[PDB]
Amino acid sequence: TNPCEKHSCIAVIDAGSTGSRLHIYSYDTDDTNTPIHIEEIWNKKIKPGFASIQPNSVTIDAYLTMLLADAPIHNIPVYFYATAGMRLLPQSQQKKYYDELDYWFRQQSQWQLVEAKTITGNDEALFDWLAVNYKLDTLKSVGVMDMGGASVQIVFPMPKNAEISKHNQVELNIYGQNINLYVHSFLGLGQTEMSHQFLNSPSCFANDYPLPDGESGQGNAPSCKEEVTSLMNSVHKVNQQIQPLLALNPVNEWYSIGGISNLASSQLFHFENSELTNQSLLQQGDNQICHQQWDILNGQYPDDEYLYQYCLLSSYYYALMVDGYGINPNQTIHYIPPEQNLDWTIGVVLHR
Amino acid sequence: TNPCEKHSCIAVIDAGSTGSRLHIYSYDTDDTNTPIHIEEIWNKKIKPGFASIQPNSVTIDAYLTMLLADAPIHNIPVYFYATAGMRLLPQSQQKKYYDELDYWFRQQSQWQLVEAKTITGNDEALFDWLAVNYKLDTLKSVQNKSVGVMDMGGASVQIVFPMPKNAEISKHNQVELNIYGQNINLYVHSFLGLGQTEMSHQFLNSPSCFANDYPLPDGESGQGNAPSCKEEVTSLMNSVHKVNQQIQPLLALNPVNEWYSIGGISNLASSQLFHFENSELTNQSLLQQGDNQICHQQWDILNGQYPDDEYLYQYCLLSSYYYALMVDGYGINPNQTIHYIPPEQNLDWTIGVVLHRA
Ligand SMILES: Nc1ncnc2c1ncn2[C@@H]1O[C@H](COP(=O)(O)OP(=O)(O)NP(=O)(O)O)[C@@H](O)[C@H]1O
Ligand SMILES: Nc1ncnc2c1ncn2[C@@H]1O[C@H](COP(=O)(O)OP(=O)(O)NP(=O)(O)O)[C@@H](O)[C@H]1O
Ligand SMILES: [Mg+2]
Ligand SMILES: [Mg+2]
Missing domain, CATH: 3.30.420.150 (Exopolyphosphatase. Domain 2)
Known part of the structure; x- marks a missing residue:
């Protein structure tokens, strides 16, 4: 059974220097709308780091597809947050990654990308x-x-x-x-x-x-x-x-x-x-x-x-x-x- | 017409941390078989560094193909020498790159790979x-x-x-x-x-x-x-x-x-x-x-x-x-x-x- 039918779910991708980790979380919220009962319902890792692959459409499409293809559930919000791997690159180069990644998300419907950025x-x-x-x-x-x-x-x-x-x-x-x-x-x-x-x-x-x-x-x-x-x-x-x-x-x-x-x-x-x-x-x-x-x-x-x-x-x-x-x-x-x-x-x- | 039809030629690949550069040189030899009159007859540079790609056969094959494929001449000794980008890696991880690289060259009809190693x-x-x-x-x-x-x-x-x-x-x-x-x-x-x-x-x-x-x-x-x-x-x-x-x-x-x-x-x-x-x-x-x-x-x-x-x-x-x-x-x-x-x-x-x- 899909917990996301009955509880809030989001996907968070930790795009770290050594690899990316997808986590899907289900949660409820309390009376201030703060999450409680947070449970990881899916996780998937892939290597290498997103900032280490060539920023072209074939390579980036393949990486994202590999990351997400075996997710049992989809049609949920996704936060793609890159860390120090991406921080090592100038803006101009990071822009190539995000332009290709944004396009890939825009061109599909299984995931609703909320934000993709270097934190x-x-x-x-x-x-x-x-x-x-x-x-x-x-x-x-x-x-x-x-x-x-x-x-x-x-x-x-x-x-x-x-x-x-x-x-x-x-x-x-x-x-x-x-x-x-x-x-x-x-x-x-x-x-x-x-x-x-x-x-x-x-x-x-x-x-x-x-x-x-x-x-x-x-x-x-x-x-x-x-x-x-x-x-x-x-x-x-x-x-x-x-x-x-x-x-x-x-x-x-x-x-x-x-x-x-x-x-x-x-x-x-x-x-x-x-x-x-x-x-x-x-x-x-x-x-x-x-x-x-x-x-x-x-x-x-x-x-x-x-x-x-x-x-x-x-x-x-x-x-x-x-x-x-x-x-x-x-x-x-x-x-x-x-x-x-x-x-x-x-x-x-x-x-x- | 290659100058390689009239002069010895060698390919040397600088596999640097930021990218790889193929050079092909023509040369003559003197009385000791030492090269003289060295001239670059072909150069191709690609990015990123060899050591920065995933060491599976698909990626190595695409990479080498892009580096080597359009070279005017193949039946020449090749020296593939990687520098500091590969030095950053332990011998075990580098071994993977050389294994697939060696494999790839052996599937080539002409290239005589003399050495591929990290210097x-x-x-x-x-x-x-x-x-x-x-x-x-x-x-x-x-010199003075x-x-x-x-x-x-x-x-x-x-x-x-x-x-x-x-x-x-x-x-x-x-x-x-x-x-x-x-x-x-x-x-x-x-x-x-x-x-x-x-x-x-x-x-x-x-x-x-x-x-x-x-x-x-x-x-x-x-x-x-x-x-x-x-x-x-x-x-x-x-x-x-x-x-x-x-x-x-x-x-x-x-x-x-x-x-x-x-x-x-x-x-x-x-x-x-x-x-x-x-x-x-x-x-x-x-x-x-x-x-x-x-x-x-x-x-x-x-x-x-x-x-x-x-x-x-x-x-x-x-x-x-x-x-x-x-x-x-x-x-x-x-x-x-x-x-x-x-x-x-x-x-x-x-x-x-x-x-x-020398
Ligand atoms: N068995 C191990 N022993 C020691 N270090 C390890 C081992 N396995 C992995 N590491 C390293 O642990 C470090 C931290 O890994 P990790 O926390 O996954 O970094 P990351 O999130 O990919 N990088 P960053 O973007 O800086 O947060 C990395 O340098 C790994 O290479
Ligand atoms: N068109 C350019 N304009 C300005 N700088 C550049 C340009 N092209 C390359 N560079 C700089 O030169 C650096 C690469 O120098 P290079 O001597 O080619 O290193 P390498 O041979 O790849 N590394 P190594 O294995 O350590 O010898 C690049 O990271 C850039 O900073
Ligand atoms: Mg991390
Ligand atoms: Mg160099």
Whole structure:
């Protein structure tokens, strides 16, 4: 039975840097017409990222058709929201994608496209916080981090302030509560973009890993983390931007979504209760990957295509959270299990 | 009538991060079977980069078909050499591309594929140096001058210059060539991630790096100022990559008399926004012109003037970045002439591959 016959349904597409995810949600609304009882009734992922394909009609039509063809239900509103992958492209180039995508939607009737656009990382951060808090049942101090492929977001409660950019603040009324959040997104600090600066760094790879430029890995996670910290703080000034704010607005519980949940759940790392600490993350990466002999390690774990980057990723998450955001290395960080497929798209259901 | 009916020909494909370029060269050989009288007889360039497409047989087949199909001649050795766009990928993901590429060529009636592989940046640098010094005719005789070459690519940058063998420098960063009866020792270095595309992804929300009121992706407005943009880019060059500490001491010990640059810098310098004489720039002049003509302009006004240039929005950032890399990184004097090659000449490192007998 189609839930959309009897309940509001929308489709939200998270067009992320590494792939697009369609979610169809059914929901009801309460007496202020705010969604409740939100349920995902369909999901479909496809790779690669929308911003990575050629922006011509044949390629874009094929991608959208592949994304939507097996949806059991249709004739519902669609929000197509691209994130940091598309943010990396100039307007002129993004325009080619949206002109072809708009045309494809206009030329068909199975989906009612509401909006297709690149959202800002600040909007993305708001959606991240709403989606995680919706799932946690908190909406009736929680910080959220989304560790993406091309950007990362951080978002936490902070009273409305005149000294910070209006761009970095959002005020929300949800289930009759007033909420003010600081939002920030760091474009270029997502895992794929960041990693392109460190691929010839021997400290960031297992011993004897073959670096692209012919040297050998000689892994050491505290050294690799220091290198990544220079990108975080000397280049993007993460610490200068975030730490004074977290100082004055401490966060009681941290939740993370994005690639860190895949790292933490992989067979190389050992965490309980879907949570980690930065100290443990760094140590595990240092001892289980950085200090291992690559050939031997690669032979032991042949079915993890991310294995080669784990010394770097563990060092990078520590640099970002501890040296960037100022989070205590012993503070618990909850991550949402990957099986949940949780991205920010719930936040779009809610806001609107 | 091909010149290939009367002269040896080779195809060399530069599979770069931003696109692929097929060159076919005719040449003769001298008394050692070394190529001489090298001439480009065909060139075709396509976009996007090889490494940016999905590695299934359909896409690879369309791509290669579009690159190779209308070439005047097939029964010639081919060298397919990918550079920094493929280096960004782990060996396992690259293996997929080469598997299908190898398959595809084997279905071709004539093309004799000699090698298809990803080259290191150090090899790319050796080819960069050979290609430019071949065009300058400086390879047949010992020079009274040191010629330095830079290749300003989209995903890596190379720098290469003469340097006597140094047992204190990694063997990886040194190359001894023998060509045309001549012994040449070079320092080579490639900086992966400092190519213009990869670097730019770190600075897209930097208001100093874009024209006034340019719509930055996270919703703030451009407010360009090239020296400030330049100082930001310098943090990536030096605080992250330590370019100044790696390169400047070496150039102090091994001074270069003439600098040549190839790569996308020629496209920037050749823009109608810039004024340069004799296909040469200086970093001071590039930074000043970017500052005046882009950083300090009103984006809506400037875009309305050049609705059809897809690169213009980045010219404040690129002017600043080239200065950061060449001056604050490599220590090149900002008033020193940097020779660039007109884009129409299609000079990339692929001539170096013709001379690989070096
Ligand atoms: N098993 C894994 N271990 C470590 N990282 C992983 C793993 N699987 C996927 N990733 C990466 O996790 C990162 C975050 O993935 P994801 O959150 O899907 O990014 P995205 O939404 O596509 N990017 P963005 O547009 O910036 O939000 C990406 O860099 C993936 O490449
Ligand atoms: N018509 C043009 N006008 C201005 N800039 C251009 C033009 N065409 C190309 N470019 C710039 O040049 C960059 C590509 O330089 P190029 O040296 O071709 O890199 P590549 O060989 O593809 N990358 P790599 O693998 O690292 O060597 C492009 O990203 C553009 O920024
Ligand atoms: Mg994402
Ligand atoms: Mg190149």
